Amino acid sequence: ASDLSWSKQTDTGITHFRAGMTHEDEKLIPTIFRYITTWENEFLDSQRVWAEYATKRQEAIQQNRRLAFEELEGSWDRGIPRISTLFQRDRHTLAYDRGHRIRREFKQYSLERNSPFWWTNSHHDGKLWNLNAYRTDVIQALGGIETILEHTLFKGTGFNSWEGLFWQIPNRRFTLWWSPTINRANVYVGFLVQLDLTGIFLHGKIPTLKISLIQIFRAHLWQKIHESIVFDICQILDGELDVLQIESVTKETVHPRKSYKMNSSAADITMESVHEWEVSKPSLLHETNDSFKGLITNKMWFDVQLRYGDYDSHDISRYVRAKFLDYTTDNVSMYPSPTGVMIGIDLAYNMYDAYGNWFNGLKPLIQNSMRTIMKANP
Amino acid sequence: VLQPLLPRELPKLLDALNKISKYYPGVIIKVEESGEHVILGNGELYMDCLLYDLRASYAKIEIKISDPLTVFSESCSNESFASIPVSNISVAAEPMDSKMIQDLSRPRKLSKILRTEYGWDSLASRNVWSFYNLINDTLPDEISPELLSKYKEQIIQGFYWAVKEGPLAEEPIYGVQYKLLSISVPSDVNIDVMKSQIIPLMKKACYVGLLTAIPILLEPIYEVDITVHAPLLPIVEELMKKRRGSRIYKTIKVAGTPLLEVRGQVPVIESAGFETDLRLSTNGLGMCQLYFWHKIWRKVPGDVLDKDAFIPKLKPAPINSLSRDFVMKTRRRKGISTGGFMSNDGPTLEKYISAEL
Amino acid sequence: SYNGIGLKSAKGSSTSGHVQRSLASNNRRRPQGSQQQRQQRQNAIKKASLAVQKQIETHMEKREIEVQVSELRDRLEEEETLSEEQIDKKCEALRAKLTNEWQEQQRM
Amino acid sequence: FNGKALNNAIPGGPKFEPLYPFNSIDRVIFRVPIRSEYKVAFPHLYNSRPRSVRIPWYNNPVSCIIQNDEEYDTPALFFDPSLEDFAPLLAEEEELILPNTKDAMSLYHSPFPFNRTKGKMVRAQDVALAKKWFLQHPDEEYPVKVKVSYQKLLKNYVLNELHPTLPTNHNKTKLLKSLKNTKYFQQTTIDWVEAGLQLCRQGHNMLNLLIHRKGLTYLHLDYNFNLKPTKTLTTKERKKSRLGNSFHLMRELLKMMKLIVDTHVQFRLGNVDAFQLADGIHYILNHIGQLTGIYRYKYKVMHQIRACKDLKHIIYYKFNKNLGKGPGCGFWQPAWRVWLNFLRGTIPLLERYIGNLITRQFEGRS
Amino acid sequence: KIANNLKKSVVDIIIKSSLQESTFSKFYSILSERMITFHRSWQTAYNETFEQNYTQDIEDYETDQLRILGKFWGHLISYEFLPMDCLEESCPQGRIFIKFLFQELVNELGLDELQLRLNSSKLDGMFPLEGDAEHIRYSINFFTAIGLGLLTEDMRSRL
RNA sequence: UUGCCUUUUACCAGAACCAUCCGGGUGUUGUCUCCAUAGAAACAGGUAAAGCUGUAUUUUUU
RNA sequence: UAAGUGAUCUAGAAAG
Ligand SMILES: O=P(O)(O)O[C@H]1[C@H](OP(=O)(O)O)[C@@H](OP(=O)(O)O)[C@H](OP(=O)(O)O)[C@@H](OP(=O)(O)O)[C@H]1OP(=O)(O)O
Numbered sequence A: 001a002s003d004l005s006w007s008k009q010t011d012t013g014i015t016h017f018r019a020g021m022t023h024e025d026e027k028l029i030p031t032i033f034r035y036i037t038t039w040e041n042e043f044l045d046s047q048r049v050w051a052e053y054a055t056k057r058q059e060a061i062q063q064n065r066r067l068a069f070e071e072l073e074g075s076w077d078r079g080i081p082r083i084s085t086l087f088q089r090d091r092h093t094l095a096y097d098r099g100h101r102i103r104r105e106f107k108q109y110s111l112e113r114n115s116p117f118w119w120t121n122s123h124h125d126g127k128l129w130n131l132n133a134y135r136t137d138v139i140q141a142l143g144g145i146e147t148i149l150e151h152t153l154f155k156g157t158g159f160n161s162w163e164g165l166f167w168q169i170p171n172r173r174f175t176l177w178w179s180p181t182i183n184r185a186n187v188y189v190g191f192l193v194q195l196d197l198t199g200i201f202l203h204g205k206i207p208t209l210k211i212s213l214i215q216i217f218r219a220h221l222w223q224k225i226h227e228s229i230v231f232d233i234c235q236i237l238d239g240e241l242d243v244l245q246i247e248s249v250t251k252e253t254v255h256p257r258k259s260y261k262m263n264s265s266a267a268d269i270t271m272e273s274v275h276e277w278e279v280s281k282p283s284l285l286h287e288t289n290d291s292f293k294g295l296i297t298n299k300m301w302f303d304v305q306l307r308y309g310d311y312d313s314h315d316i317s318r319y320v321r322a323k324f325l326d327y328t329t330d331n332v333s334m335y336p337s338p339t340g341v342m343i344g345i346d347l348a349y350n351m352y353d354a355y356g357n358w359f360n361g362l363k364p365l366i367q368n369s370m371r372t373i374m375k376a377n378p
Numbered sequence B: 001v002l003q004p005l006l007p008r009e010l011p012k013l014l015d016a017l018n019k020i021s022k023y024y025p026g027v028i029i030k031v032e033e034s035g036e037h038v039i040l041g042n043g044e045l046y047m048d049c050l051l052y053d054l055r056a057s058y059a060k061i062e063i064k065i066s067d068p069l070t071v072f073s074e075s076c077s078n079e080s081f082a083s084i085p086v087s088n089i090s091v092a093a094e095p096m097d098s099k100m101i102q103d104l105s106r107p108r109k110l111s112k113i114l115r116t117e118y119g120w121d122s123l124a125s126r127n128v129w130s131f132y133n134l135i136n137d138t139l140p141d142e143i144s145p146e147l148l149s150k151y152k153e154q155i156i157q158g159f160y161w162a163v164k165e166g167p168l169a170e171e172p173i174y175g176v177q178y179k180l181l182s183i184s185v186p187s188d189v190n191i192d193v194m195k196s197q198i199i200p201l202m203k204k205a206c207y208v209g210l211l212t213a214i215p216i217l218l219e220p221i222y223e224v225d226i227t228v229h230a231p232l233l234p235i236v237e238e239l240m241k242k243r244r245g246s247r248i249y250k251t252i253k254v255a256g257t258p259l260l261e262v263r264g265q266v267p268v269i270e271s272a273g274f275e276t277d278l279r280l281s282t283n284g285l286g287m288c289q290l291y292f293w294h295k296i297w298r299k300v301p302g303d304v305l306d307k308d309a310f311i312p313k314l315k316p317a318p319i320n321s322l323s324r325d326f327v328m329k330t331r332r333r334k335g336i337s338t339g340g341f342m343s344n345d346g347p348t349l350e351k352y353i354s355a356e357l
Numbered sequence C: 001s002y003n004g005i006g007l008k009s010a011k012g013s014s015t016s017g018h019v020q021r022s023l024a025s026n027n028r029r030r031p032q033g034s035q036q037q038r039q040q041r042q043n044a045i046k047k048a049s050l051a052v053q054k055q056i057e058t059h060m061e062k063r064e065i066e067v068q069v070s071e072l073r074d075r076l077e078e079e080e081t082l083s084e085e086q087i088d089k090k091c092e093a094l095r096a097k098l099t100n101e102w103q104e105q106q107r108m
Numbered sequence D: 001f002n003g004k005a006l007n008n009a010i011p012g013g014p015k016f017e018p019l020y021p022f023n024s025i026d027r028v029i030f031r032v033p034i035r036s037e038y039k040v041a042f043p044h045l046y047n048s049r050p051r052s053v054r055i056p057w058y059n060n061p062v063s064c065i066i067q068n069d070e071e072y073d074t075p076a077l078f079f080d081p082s083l084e085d086f087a088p089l090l091a092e093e094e095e096l097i098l099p100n101t102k103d104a105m106s107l108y109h110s111p112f113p114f115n116r117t118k119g120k121m122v123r124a125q126d127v128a129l130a131k132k133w134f135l136q137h138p139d140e141e142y143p144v145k146v147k148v149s150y151q152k153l154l155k156n157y158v159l160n161e162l163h164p165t166l167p168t169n170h171n172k173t174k175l176l177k178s179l180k181n182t183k184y185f186q187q188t189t190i191d192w193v194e195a196g197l198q199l200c201r202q203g204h205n206m207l208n209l210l211i212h213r214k215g216l217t218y219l220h221l222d223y224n225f226n227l228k229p230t231k232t233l234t235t236k237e238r239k240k241s242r243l244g245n246s247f248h249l250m251r252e253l254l255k256m257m258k259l260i261v262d263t264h265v266q267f268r269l270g271n272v273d274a275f276q277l278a279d280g281i282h283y284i285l286n287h288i289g290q291l292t293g294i295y296r297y298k299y300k301v302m303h304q305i306r307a308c309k310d311l312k313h314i315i316y317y318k319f320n321k322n323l324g325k326g327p328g329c330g331f332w333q334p335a336w337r338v339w340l341n342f343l344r345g346t347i348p349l350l351e352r353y354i355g356n357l358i359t360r361q362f363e364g365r366s
Numbered sequence E: 001k002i003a004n005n006l007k008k009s010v011v012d013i014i015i016k017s018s019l020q021e022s023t024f025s026k027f028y029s030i031l032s033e034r035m036i037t038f039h040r041s042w043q044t045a046y047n048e049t050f051e052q053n054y055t056q057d058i059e060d061y062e063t064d065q066l067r068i069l070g071k072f073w074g075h076l077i078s079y080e081f082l083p084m085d086c087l088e089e090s091c092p093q094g095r096i097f098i099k100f101l102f103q104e105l106v107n108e109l110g111l112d113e114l115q116l117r118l119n120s121s122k123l124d125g126m127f128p129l130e131g132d133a134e135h136i137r138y139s140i141n142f143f144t145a146i147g148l149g150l151l152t153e154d155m156r157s158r159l
Numbered sequence F: 001u002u003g004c005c006u007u008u009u010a011c012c013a014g015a016a017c018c019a020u021c022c023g024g025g026u027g028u029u030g031u032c033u034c035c036a037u038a039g040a041a042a043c044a045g046g047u048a049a050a051g052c053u054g055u056a057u058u059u060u061u062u
Numbered sequence G: 001u002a003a004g005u006g007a008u009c010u011a012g013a014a015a016g
């Protein structure tokens, strides 16, 4: 964008560059123009390669041989027409297609879908461009395949690898794929609402996305998942009842709301002990050095806390910690003990984590449990 | 240079201009040959005020305006080597003495004595003068024997025309002497038809002299006054460096306050938005001023009469290319040059003596 | 817009309308100084390269004589020569002596 | 204004939509590269073809030497010059300077707020603690976004300055005054929190009354003014229940109010510390968009939201110079001012809108 | 804002990118010009890159890539380097690169003009005048491969 | 008049017109409140305190 | 006599 008032009079050297198609977090998307051989180059090049071809044809004549494409390789993709046009599957048919350019031009006047590439024909001239380069370069430039999928709901599917992927309905798929990016935590004005029966906080309505997610969690699926996990935990506790000195593993029956209610939380499992337990200070699962203070508990509680992350809220540990010492230290939905345990599952990323107090020799069981459930909960 | 945006509203502007002239005494308002009117402001702010008054309250018309040009003035560096006459008059020229320039910018015997006081000049040259604006010396050999040299009043007026519209680009002449050397008056002629010849012929002669005198173009220079806080002193210097031809002469420290009321000199061309720029750079601690009462003209660097001369169309032209650019551009402005490509040069025979032989 | 060079305004454009100065501008700012050797070479390649003079000489000569005349005038008008005869006589003398000397010059 | 009128935006300040839709290169001599800064300085001269252009000021050089501390009357920053029984006036006044005059001089040089030692009150609202930051120049090397914010703020300011909205004087019967005149209102001294809570209760009752009146009892108002349907809606029912941009806007304003009042309640109910309250309020004001879909219904509120964002950007980076990053800044004043002015703007609009609405509820539609 | 350390590396990268393409682009040439113009350091970098190319990297390339490189260098040579040219023995692909370069130069400047330009310069490896016993034969021979004059003249001079 | 768009609301941001609204100023009346609550003092002076003037040898008066 | 200061639009709801 040079000086508009001067530029009208004379050509300027370009002085000032305006920002064209900009973006926040500007990853330098390569253009297309760099990956197309500019015409002058193409034409000088053409002259060269055709000259070469001519020379080799003479050589062939002198030698009395068929000038095969084994010898002309390299120049195969160059020149105008493309050298490839010499050895395609039917030149001796296309020899009699004179007046081809004109016919292509006048398709304009005789058809609805007038072709965008009227100006050439691939049979006559071959591929005058090749944009696989553009594809490859672009993927390399958006942090690679590796990094694009952090935007997507690839982590939600839970494949072994993305490399093992290969072998208003169609755009729904597209929307669902970029669920995390599109339904993003950091956002301008978007008002928060949650979809029905779920913890899928949409930051401003999107219709297609909403449709997708709702179909995803049809049949109260979120609630079912929540309850399922709770059941599993209960089962585990029952199994390892005598190992950790537990008097009773009772399920505190909450409303169906609890599963997906986020402002509050009643405890899912309540844990009546045999003896006083001396639980550690609150900590994460993988935080190994659990500090055993003199405080004791006659009763713990286990809560699940399902969540559906975004490309911005995709750490769970922090979230679960927040949840734990939010609902404890909040005068709505009190747990029987302020000392307890809280699990949370990022359903969008399969990122389990849990925070809270720890009975001695319990942590390993919980870690293993979570590992198992994540590997295969129904 | 004003032009009304619509030629339909031209008379109004003329009327408006008249009003402006009446109201703003320090405005030479030359109506240039094209129709494009010239307005000579004292400086920037004054000029702006004038324009505001014109454009708002007298004209009430939209007005095309040239970027601020400066009234240049043609002159010489050395005495004219040749003395080529004029016909269907050979006027030599030379640079007036620098003391005498100043003396001029503010009874024959008495004047002669004065001249000898100024520059110790000869009594012959002292007697024969008739200056204006610079000096018209009637100093051939035959002129004292002759009374064809008499009735030089018409001749002097022709000389006045020369002074008004110089050879280079209708730019007024400054700081130049004019030694006459011959006149081509035949025996039988009417004073009307002879005088009439001599008037434009006088101009031609003057121009010729200038050409042969190694003509140089003179731009003016604003005397500068910049009060600034001492801490922002080198900034000013830097700015001056950024400007062209700008000199800084004494940084007199104004007692009892941080102001270093520094005098300077910016060439009137280079000066434009100087006050504003200074203010910006100085964070509004540099209430600067420009003015022109000394009449301290000076040579634009670089030499007139060059073919290639310069590089840029957009960018500011180099130091040594400058004068030529100013001349050609001003000729274009004044409509003297033919199209884009042209040249200021001598209109005389003998192939210019084969270009100085 | 900024210095005759920004976008008219960011509405429309469908972009930031952010306006960098290029840094090839420094190249376009000083290409004559950078490629001075291009013209320098060229210049070097072509770097080697009477009547009026006569007229000037004549003027100087006659002028000199006229200076003599002036001097005579000075001497007369200042120091005891109120009459016109003195002036005219002086002039005559100048002519005779001057043009004598200059005749000598001519001869040489 | 000049910058506006010529599209010659001074880069530190605002840039507007353009006011509108010989001189050849051969002729002129580009010696001075003629800058935009000049094009507004001497607008009639450097900028040819000006239209609707003001004339700016032009000025004298200021040498107001300020003192640091612990002294008086001293040349510091500058250099010095080269070279019948009666006492003078005000005798027996030995001390030249009083203990306050060191400060009085400073006060004297100050600008309009402190300049003077008497004034009329203004509404907290009417004081602009934030205007003076962005009107004066941005300090030093803030992130691009903050610079943008500054520019945005200036753009607003200039617009406000430019379209003077002269208040009409004949209508000197205010709303409250009018209400005061009648019998059906009484007046009491109530705690602001009480007023808030009572107004949430009142507002809730109002909106529920309206909704039920309409007939659509299946739209359950939550006490947090977050409306949602109870049952799955029959198409007819759904059609009926699309409440318009009046009712929803009312709800949103109450939501806004319900938030800040609730925060105050929390503060005062012993939950949170006053700093926490201040931060809370600030958060609410800067995230009205994110806390209540006001924009949904009346999208021009984006301006207000944008303004708030700008303020936050400005405030924080004057609030976090040496201080690091984090959420703990309060200072809710200028944003609060913004919201007040938005309410001022809308009070007419909602009087009309909801007026018509309830009229329709009562009288049939025309 | 790249420091003086990697400028050379940057230039190398640019060159490699150029090579990757099908043909020589005006684009890269213009970029090279701009950078060169900018700061003396970048001029140095470009030079040293050139040295690296004809020294060691040159012989690794294929005739297409190599040709492109030659073209690029020729374009640069025509303006923003001095024709300093560290150049019998080494004729694997380097000599053909040189051929390409010369071709580019001739196409750009012109034959007689080119000769004049080189005449002004030293040109030790390209145009030796001191015979060195049937060694000018080599250079002369190589330049006869392309349309060049004055080789004959040189041989006449040398006998 | 532009922009997003394309169907309208809702909008983008400029213009010209206009209105609404949040407020403001005074001035006059009246009310409400809290404090109040005297129908006569000078002159002759004195006492004490407040406002101006005062402390001949050529044109004012020695 | 040989570099790099700076200009950074949007932004979501209804009904179709
Ligand atoms: O610029 P915005 O989109 O309005 O977002 C801002 C911004 O965050 P980003 O820079 O990540 O966008 C601020 O970060 P800084 O620029 O100040 O580093 C941050 O302010 P704090 O750093 O003071 O937290 C603030 O967050 P918050 O609202 O918690 O103050 C946050 O606003 P959002 O949280 O609404 O995005």
Ligand SMILES: [Mg+2]
Residues within 6 Å of the ligand: none
């Ligand atoms: Mg319709």
